[PDB]
């Protein structure tokens, strides 16, 4: 099980496969002034992902975040990096990620995000 930290580029996956059940993954994203994914501007954010599941025809991540809602840019930057093909459509000022396992969630906003892609999936329980 491999986690990636550093400069994000197209084809990067933050993990190489789904972690085992119960894993909480912290990812902190630091863009520049003009970082774009699929023409959408990326602002900084921190997430603690409790699980990603497939529901119907979408991937659904349940996470705790330092911010009240994620933009489409932040959703795609996160979820594309949880797929085998990895991040796509990223350009502009470099974005860095730090990815780590943490023992317990710390952030205070519970968010559910989805996209019609094939993320790596793992359960919380």
Residue numbers in the entry: 78 to 202
What does the paper say about this structure?
In group B rotavirus, which causes significant diarrheal outbreaks in adults, the VP8* domain (VP8*B) surprisingly lacks sequence similarity with VP8* of group A or group C rotavirus. Here, by using the recently developed AlphaFold2 for ab initio structure prediction and validating the predicted model by determining a 1.3-Å crystal structure, we show that VP8*B exhibits a novel fold distinct from the galectin fold. This fold with a β-sheet clasping an α-helix represents a new fold for glycan recognition based on glycan array screening, which shows that VP8*B recognizes glycans containing N-acetyllactosamine moiety. Despite the novel fold, based on our glycan screening study, it is likely that VP8*B, similar to the VP8* of RVA and RVC, retains the same functionality of mediating the initial cell attachment by recognizing specific glycans in the gut.
As a representative VP8*B, the amino acid sequence of a human RVB, isolated from a gastroenteritis outbreak in India32, was expressed and purified for structure determination by X-ray crystallography. We used the well-ordered region of VP8*B (residues 83–192) in the AlphaFold2-predicted fold as a search model for MR, and determined the crystal structure of native VP8*B at 1.3-Å resolution. The crystallographic asymmetric unit contains two VP8*B molecules in addition to a short peptide. Although we purified and crystallized the recombinant VP8*B containing residues 65–233 of VP4, only the residues F78-N202 are observed in the crystal structure. The electron density of the N- and C-terminal residues are not observed due to their flexibility or a proteolytic cleavage that may have occurred during crystallization. The small peptide with four residues could be the protease cleavage product co-crystallized with the globular portion of the VP8*B. The electron density of the side chains does not match any residues of the N or C terminus of VP8*B, possibly due to heterogeneity of the short peptide and the lack of sequence specificity of the peptide-binding. The VP8*B structure contains seven β-strands and one α-helix. Five of these β-strands form a twisted antiparallel β-sheet that surrounds a central α-helix. Structural comparison of the two shows a high degree of similarity between the models with a Cα RMSD of 0.398 Å and 0.403 Å with the two VP8*B molecules in the asymmetric unit, respectively. Interestingly, the side chain of Q195 also interacts with His131 that is present in different conformations in the predicted and experimental models, suggesting that subtle changes in solution may affect glycan-binding during virus infection.
